[PDB]
Amino acid sequence: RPDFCLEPPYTGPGKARIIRYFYNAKAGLAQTFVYGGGRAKRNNFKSAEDALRTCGGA
């Protein structure tokens, strides 16, 4: 599994409220989070389906 997939989400310092997806380590689900619009980390997807294709598999 890529090495960023089990990290908590990262809002960053931006002031936007963009609804992105992260792969939730505990649950194994794609979940929404509020992204601030800059300085993303890699557990940050535009859709649930992208989060699962990248992070869902062991």
UniProtKB/Swiss-Prot annotation:
Q: Which cysteines are joined by disulfide bonds?
A: 5-55, 14-38, 30-51
Main localization of the protein described in the UniProt heading: secreted
Q: Which residues form the BPTI/Kunitz inhibitor domain?
A: 5-55
Cite a single GO BP annotation.
negative regulation of platelet aggregation
Residues the UniProt record annotates as site (Reactive bond for trypsin): 15-16
Which keywords, in A-to-Z order, does the entry hold? Disulfide bond, Pharmaceutical, Protease inhibitor, Secreted, Serine protease inhibitor, Signal
Highest taxon above the source species: Eukaryota
Q: What does this protein do?
A: Inhibits trypsin, kallikrein, chymotrypsin, and plasmin.
What name does UniProt use for this protein?
Pancreatic trypsin inhibitor
Source organism: Bos taurus (Bovine)
